[PDB]
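Risk mitigation, structural track. In case the binding assays with GNP fail to produce interpretable data, a predicted complex structure has been prepared as a fallback.
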Amino acid sequence: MTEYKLVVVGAGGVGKSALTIQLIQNHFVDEYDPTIEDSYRKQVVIDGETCLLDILDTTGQEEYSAMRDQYMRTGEGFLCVFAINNTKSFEDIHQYREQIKRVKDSDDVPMVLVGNKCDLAARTVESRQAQDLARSYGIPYIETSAKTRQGVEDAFYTLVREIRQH
Ligand SMILES: Nc1nc2c(ncn2[C@@H]2O[C@H](COP(=O)(O)OP(=O)(O)NP(=O)(O)O)[C@@H](O)[C@H]2O)c(=O)[nH]1
Ligand SMILES: [Mg+2]
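Fallback model:
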């Protein structure tokens, strides 16, 4: 069947795993559990199409920046995740976007900019400036909460549709 190779990238602790685990396992992991590299394959139906989501849940640890190239080449679509209460993770987005572009020899890679943790009231990244960023990349901006599940399916399914339109 059609498979979509999705990759979730971003600074440590933004909720990359929490987002993936909500989507695949319908619950919120509220605990400390840094990722090395986890893969999730799940058969779903999206807009009537039987397909396989092949999701790579990556690490934010900057020491492994050199090992990102290999999985970025293979990924068809990318969630670039920051947390709306972590300004540094939003500044870090640019470095992820640029490495993906460099490694993919592409400046129109399927990609969604994801503002996660939108359940938290203590926001430090205004939605408008994240939206301004996504507009300058030419990609959708979606806010999510892995805790409440708000926007989660939206972010992943939009990414799949970005791949279908590429
Ligand atoms: N309130 C709230 N907390 C969240 C949300 N997503 C993740 N968290 C919490 O934030 C922490 C980090 O989440 P995690 O998913 O492990 O982050 P990560 O980006 O995978 N980290 P790593 O890069 O090390 O693998 C955890 O305590 C998690 O429960 C969210 O949407 N809302
Ligand atoms: Mg993780």
